[PDB]
Design a protein around this ligand. Structure first.
Ligand SMILES: Nc1nonc1N1CCCCC1
Length: 119
């Protein structure tokens, strides 16, 4: 990550961009596994093996409350969603597949956000 990402405090204009990025991911066809916290009734062992769970509704709550002070912190929460999924699930599962697709989409949108910040 460059100078600006780590170091620049997030402004109110930055927050309008982050809201737009998050809504784009929530609208993606392969975001369904990540929209809400993992239901433990679907996997009674999940919260024993994943120590820092994350999901897009938790991220939306945090954006609304202005939790994030730097872009790096927002990126770290988003990356946790995809890394948790690839550690819990095998590489041939549809959940793993969805993480691969959605992370590539996030990277495209994040590059767009960074470009709009700089000019
Ligand atoms: N929603 C998910 N995203 O990644 N992995 C997920 N799981 C939900 C189904 C049982 C536990 C694993």
């Amino acid at each position: 990550e460059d100078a600006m990402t780590v170091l620049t405090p997030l402004t109110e204009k930055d927050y309008e961009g982050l809201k737009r990025v998050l809504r784009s991911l929530q609208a993606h066809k392969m975001a369904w596994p990540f929209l809400e916290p993992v239901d433990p009734n679907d996997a009674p062992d999940y919260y024993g093996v994943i120590k820092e769970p994350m999901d897009l509704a938790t991220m939306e709550e945090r954006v609304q409350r202005r939790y994030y002070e730097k872009l790096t912190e927002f990126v770290a929460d988003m990356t946790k969603i995809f890394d948790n999924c690839r550690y819990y699930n095998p590489s041939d599962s549809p959940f793993y597949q969805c993480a691969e697709v959605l992370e590539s989409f996030f990277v495209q949108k994040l590059k767009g956000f960074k470009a709009s910040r700089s000019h």
